[PDB]
């Protein structure tokens with residue numbers, strides 16, 4: 001039950017760093033972790049064979065909530081990923097200057113629920129430089145593991 005997939009959409013590297021930090025935590029605990037940039041993936045069957053899936057995505061939009069561009073195709077085809085009955089958790093970087101702080105995380109969680117996923121922990125929301133939140137990131141990964 002030890003295969004974890006992490007897929008991240010990141011433009012300035014913050015959610016990517018967050019993904020790398022989570023990946024190390026899971027690997028140290030005994031998971032086999034496959035980490036992929038969303039730009040490199042196709043949605044159809046993306047979750048097949050994974051016991052745990054973690055989705056990371058930063059939040060954008062001039063005057064609306066928009067997902068990071070590389071993640072949008074995955075979100076638009078999320079119903080083809082194999083999410084039904086899948087244990088999933090979400091994370092993302094943002095900036096609390098914006099009212100909808102890490103709003104991409106909400107959008108992804110809400111769709112995953114409709115699609116039959118089991119959300120194993122509330123999404124991780126990181127404000128500003130994620131290296132300043134390293135302890136929170138590692139703690140969230142630990143908490144995700146404990147809720148499996």
Ligand SMILES: Cc1cc2nc3c(=O)[nH]c(=O)nc-3n(C[C@H](O)[C@H](O)[C@H](O)COP(=O)(O)O)c2cc1C
Pocket residue numbers: 009010011012013014015016057058059060061062064065068093094095096098099100101102103128
């Ligand atoms: C036009 C623009 C819109 C943004 N909108 C939001 C937002 O609605 N909510 C939020 O939390 N952060 C928002 N951000 C902040 C980014 O998500 C933040 O820079 C984040 O660190 C980027 O993470 P990444 O490097 O993983 O892509 C916005 C940034 C820009 C430039």
